[PDB]
Amino acid sequence: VQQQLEALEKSSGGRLGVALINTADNSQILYRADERFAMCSTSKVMAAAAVLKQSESDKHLLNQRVEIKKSDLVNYNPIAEKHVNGTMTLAELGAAALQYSDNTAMNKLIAHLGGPDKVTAFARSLGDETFRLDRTAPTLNTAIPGDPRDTTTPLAMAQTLKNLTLGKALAETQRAQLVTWLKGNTTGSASIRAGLPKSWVVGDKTGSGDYGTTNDIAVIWPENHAPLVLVTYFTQPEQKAENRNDILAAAAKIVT
C-alpha cells in the first residue's frame, strides 16, 4: 500500500499526504501524514464545529439570525448570494459552509467567533496541537509551499475529524448535526467518494486552492464494518497547477 502511494505520487508530479484511521482497531495507514499541507476549505469543518460547540451551552445560538449584505459576498457564495438583503441563521451558514463550501458562510462563522485565531484555540481544546487557521476566505486558499499559514498534518486532521464525528469532541446532538452536514456534502463526488464502493456512505469535506492543492477529508461508514476516517491532501510545485480530484479518488481506492 505504501508502494502504490509512492508511485501514484511520483507519477502525479505533486506531493501526497494520506492518513486512514480504521476505527475497528485504530490501525493507521500513513503517508507523509506528519507533513504540513494547506488545508484550504477543509478548514471549514473546524469553523462549523466551533459554532456547534457554542450551541451546547447556548440553546438560542443556532437560530440566531445574521444579516447577509451585498458587501459580504466574496468570490464563491452559491448559497449566501440567494439570501442577500435577507438573513441566514448560524445553522444555515454552517450547512452552507460545509455542503456547498460557501465562502461568505465560512466568513460569517469566523467573524461570529471573533477571528481565525478563535478557531485555532478551539482546535487546541480538542487536543489538536497542529491545526492552525490564520486567514479568512478565500485567501486561506493560497497554499504557498512552506507557508505555515492555514495548515495541518493529514494525521492531525484525521484524529480530530474522528473525534468530532465519532468521538468525544461534541455532545451527541451536536456530533449528529455535524455528521448530517458532512454526509449531505454536494462537492465531493469526484474525490474520495469516487474511489470507494458506491453502497458505502460517506461524509466529507473537500478543499481546493492554488498550487493545484486538492483536499478531501472524510468519514466512511462501510456496510458491514466499523468506520474509517480518511484524509487525502495533495499539492503541486507550480502555482497554476490544475487541481487533481482524481488523484484523491485513486489514493482512496488504494488504501481502502
Complete domains list, the chain, with CATH: 1-256 (3.40.710.10)
- Which residues does residue 234 pair with via DSSP β-bridges, in sequence order? 16
Cα 111 versus chain centre, distance = 19
The residue among 47, 78, 69 whose CA lies nearest residue 181 is: 47
Q: Which residues are catalytic?
A: 41
Backbone phi, psi, residue 204, to 5°: -145, 170
| Cα–Cα dist 209/138, whole Å | 9
Backbone phi, psi, residue 52, to 5°: -70, -30
Determined by neutron
- Which residues does residue 204 pair with via DSSP β-bridges, in sequence order? 218
Please give the full DSSP string across the chain, using - where no structure is assigned: -HHHHHHHHHHHTSEEEEEEEETTTTEEEEESTTS-EE-GGGGHHHHHHHHHHHTTT-TTTTT-EEE--TTT--S--TTGGGGTTSEEEHHHHHHHHHHS--HHHHHHHHHHHTSHHHHHHHHHHHT-SS-B----TTGGG---TT--TTEE-HHHHHHHHHHHHHSTTS-HHHHHHHHHHHHT-SS-TTTGGGGS-TTSEEEEEEEEETTTEEEEEEEEE-SSS--EEEEEEEE-SSTTPPP-HHHHHHHHHHH-
| Cα–Cα dist 193/27, whole Å | 21
**Residue 146 CB burial class (10 angstroms; 0-12, 13-18, ≥19):** exposed
Instruction: Give binding residues for substrate as ranges.
Output: 205-207
Q: Confirm if 97 and 106 have CB atoms less than 8 A apart.
A: yes
| Cα–Cα dist 244/246, whole Å | 5
- How many CB atoms are closer than 10 A to CB 23? 16
**Residue 15 CB burial class (10 angstroms; 0-12, 13-18, ≥19):** middle
Beta strands 213-221 and 201-209, pairing class: antiparallel
Dihedral, CA atoms, 255, 157, 133, 104, nearest 10 degrees? 70
Instruction: Give binding residues as ranges.
Output: 205-207
Beta strands 65-67 and 87-89, pairing class: antiparallel
- Resolution in angstrom units: 2.1
Provide the angle, in degrees to the nearest 10, between the axes of the packed helices 2-12 and 245-255: 170
